Protein: Chromatin remodeling regulator CECR2
Amino acid sequence: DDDFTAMYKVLDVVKAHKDSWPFLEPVDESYAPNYYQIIKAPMDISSMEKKLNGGLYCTKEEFVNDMKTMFRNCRKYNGESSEYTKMSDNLERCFHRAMMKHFP
Ligand code: NA
Ligand code: NA
Ligand code: NA
Ligand code: NA
Structure:
């Protein structure tokens, strides 16, 4: 399996996880005051999908970095005890499991 197919499958697993929904689309600032002032490099699953479909990823590392940035953004904006941070931790473990399966 080539890296890009592997990436597609990983994104599929992450999307399928019960806690993916806050991460599926770009953040709507109407429900996240000052989000784009606080977060330097926003990232979401649909954007990763589109980069992958548009062949904009050069390497596995770029893909992984977008995923990790997405989770860091969440933790930074929402705080440790937040519902969204709980979800980000579950989803990051989902990501890790998926990576081990599809990048063995
Ligand atoms: Na930031
Ligand atoms: Na919060
Ligand atoms: Na786990
Ligand atoms: Na899972």
Notes: Residues 39-40, 76 surround sodium ion (ligand 1) (CB under 6 Å).
